[PDB]
């Protein structure tokens, strides 16, 4: 209320970025005001072009320009394994590991207290995926939640007796901790899921 | 990320505290829940960044020639404040402050090239000479710069009849001395005042 309208509006569309602030936005409006009229109009303008022109992936369900995004496209990569995730910032966080296998997005987990159903996130999608490639290992990295563990879950048995071998992504301890500071459900986890050797 | 993407991703990196990580997580966040969200924000970029100019009295930012403060008659025409910049405007308004303002552009930083000129002094003295102030107040932030910024301005204002006051500042309130730095404590206790 003390700036006038456009500025006001600048801030209120700045809050729509994900972890800003009423605060944070008021700083970053008048900062590109004042400073870096030039880089306001750049970052208008590939807001728009992304906006507008990145889909999805008619494969993996994951962000893309292209009908084939990058990971599906590229013929170097492994087609005997498929990493399922829970979203794109997922399939991002999995790409940094030098993970070199295909990908398939589910939207979010199973929810049944926000009618969240295997309709909901693509449960039928995947099964398409599955059909129309040549897998032999199924990687569940959901989240590691109460919810992701029951979307790995569904997913498992969905696809039992198929020849698929499904695997899930480890659960324990961090590694460079002590003992003494994990978080004791995690290392209560990491006992009860001790492997020989 | 394909070439749309990383461009999203540079061009967020411009914002202030937002690192390579940060802008990687709010590209393909605003992309996999709000489209249209950030369609409305490049709208609202765009809009700002070609319509908003200055209040030619205050000098903040404002797309109107006169900022709403300006704008309205009904306040303290008896009053100037004194501050470095917009968010300094609006810090100030929520104390119920009802006087005029005058928004430098930051302070004196002769080593950067910002002397009198490129801060806005002859505009301050343009807003004082076709008003009718009796009190200016100096709302510089209290810093090395700040406090360099609003000496100047009172010399500069000195033996015109006004009165020139400076907002309080050293220990801030609400602190025990055991956990104030010691550089403030000992400017706090120099320039200690009657009670
Ligand atoms: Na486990
Ligand atoms: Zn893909
Ligand atoms: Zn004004």
Redesign the interface.
């Known amino acids: 209320?003390?700036?006038?309208?456009?500025?006001r509006?600048?801030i209120?569309?700045?809050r729509?970025?994900?972890?800003v602030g009423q605060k944070?936005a008021?700083?970053?409006?008048?900062?590109?005001?004042?400073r870096?009229?030039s880089?306001?109009?750049?970052?208008?303008?590939?807001?728009?072009?992304?906006?507008?022109?990145?889909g999805h992936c008619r494969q993996c369900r994951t962000?893309?320009?292209?009908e084939l995004?990058?990971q599906c496209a590229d013929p170097r990569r492994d087609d005997s394994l498929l990493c399922v995730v829970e979203?794109?910032?997922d399939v991002?966080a999995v790409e940094q590991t030098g993970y070199r296998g295909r990908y398939f997005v589910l939207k979010g987990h199973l929810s049944p207290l926000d009618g969240l159903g295997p309709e909901a996130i693509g449960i039928p999608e995947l099964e398409a995926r599955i059909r129309d490639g040549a897998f032999s290992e199924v990687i569940l990295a959901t989240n590691p939640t109460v919810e992701g563990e029951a979307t790995a879950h569904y997913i498992a048995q969905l696809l039992a007796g198929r020849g698929l071998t499904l695997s899930r992504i480890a659960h324990g301890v961090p590694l460079g901790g002590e003992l003494e500071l994990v978080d004791g459900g995690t290392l209560a986890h990491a006992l009860a899921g001790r492997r020989p050797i």
């Open positions: 209320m003390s700036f006038s309208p456009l500025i509006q600048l209120e569309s700045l729509i970025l994900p972890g944070s008021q700083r970053m409006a008048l900062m590109l005001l004042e870096d009229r880089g306001g109009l750049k970052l208008a303008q590939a807001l728009t072009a992304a906006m507008e022109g990145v962000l893309s320009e292209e995004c990058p979203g794109p910032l991002f």
